[PDB]
């Protein structure tokens, strides 16, 4: 867009291309082309019946929220705050 011409003069680019077939990849994983990134919005909820272990109950209900609607199952989530 006209924005990329102003950005490019500053040394910035918005290119974010994955070298894989079908799959997106994370920003900063080695092998992506470009120094930009793309983002999007996911809010979802998941449940699990209560067990004797809060940590495992936590893990599974999280995993169900990740797997609900837009699929981001089996990714290693790093946190930016």
């Amino acid at each position: 867009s006209e924005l990329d011409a102003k950005l490019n003069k500053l040394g910035v680019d918005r290119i974010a291309i994955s070298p894989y077939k079908q799959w997106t990849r994370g920003y900063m994983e080695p092998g992506n082309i470009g120094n930009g990134y793309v983002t999007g919005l996911k809010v979802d909820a998941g449940v699990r019946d209560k067990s004797d272990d809060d940590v495992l109950d936590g893990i599974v209900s999280y995993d169900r929220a990740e797997t609900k609607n837009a699929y981001i199952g089996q990714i290693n989530m790093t946190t930016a705050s």
Binding site: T24, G26, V38, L41, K50, Y62, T78
Partner: protein
């Protein structure tokens, strides 16, 4: 969080949803510089990410198995007791999460920002949670204007959206809010090539979500409000 000079947002900047241009603001917020900030429901944007990534039964350009995806994220857990009228302070009846994206008026010097929120609901009545949640949009708009003032950043719009679940007796609920930061594969780009990196991003920026769905031969996963969070 932040998406700045390096970013674009699915459903808005690339693969734009038509319901974005047709949306009406729910209310406006005043910013430090006296401009009004329109607040919109983020549902077109939430839906757009389901169109691109796909669902678990209909997987499309989801993240690779075992990849590292940095996410701006928060979440909350709460238990509904299996047979207790007394909720102890970590417990509740429902759980909810929220995400807000605010786009900078000038993206070459200010970043766009996400504020995210999550919490527990203490009433068995879902209509009351929905009333509360419209009030969290005002509370989040208020914190966006304060974060803006702190960095003297002015924003063009905010799109806030929610997810929730009421749990049954003896369930734990987890409500999560996440903004993934990713790389796009060539096969999701109609006419893209690994050899034309810059041109690939222009293609995606020029297609709206209907057009991209057509070019790929994918049905619309979100079409007659099929998706609920």
């Amino acid at each position: 969080x932040f998406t700045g000079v390096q970013g674009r947002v699915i459903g808005y900047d690339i693969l734009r949803s038509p319901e974005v241009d047709k949306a009406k603001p729910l209310f406006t917020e005043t910013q430090w510089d006296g401009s009004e900030l329109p607040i919109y429901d983020a549902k077109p944007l939430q839906d757009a990410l389901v169109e691109y990534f796909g669902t678990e039964q209909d997987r499309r350009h989801y993240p690779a198995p075992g990849s590292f995806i940095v996410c701006a994220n928060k979440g909350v857990t709460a238990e509904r007791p299996k047979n207790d009228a007394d909720m102890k302070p970590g417990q509740g009846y429902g759980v909810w999460s929220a995400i807000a994206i605010s786009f900078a008026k000038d993206p070459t010097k200010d970043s766009s920002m996400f504020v995210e929120d999550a919490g527990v609901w203490e009433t068995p009545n879902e209509d009351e949670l929905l009333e509360y949640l419209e009030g969290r949009r005002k509370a989040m708009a208020k914190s966006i204007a304060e974060c803006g003032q702190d960095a003297h950043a002015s924003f063009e719009s905010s799109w806030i959206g929610f997810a929730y679940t009421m749990m049954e007796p003896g369930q734990i609920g987890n409500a999560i809010t996440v903004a993934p930061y990713v790389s796009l594969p060539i096969d999701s780009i109609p006419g893209g090539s690994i050899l034309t990196p810059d041109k690939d991003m222009e293609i995606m920026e020029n297609l709206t979500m209907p057009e991209w769905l057509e070019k790929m031969g994918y049905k619309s996963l979100s079409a007659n409000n099929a998706l609920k969070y």
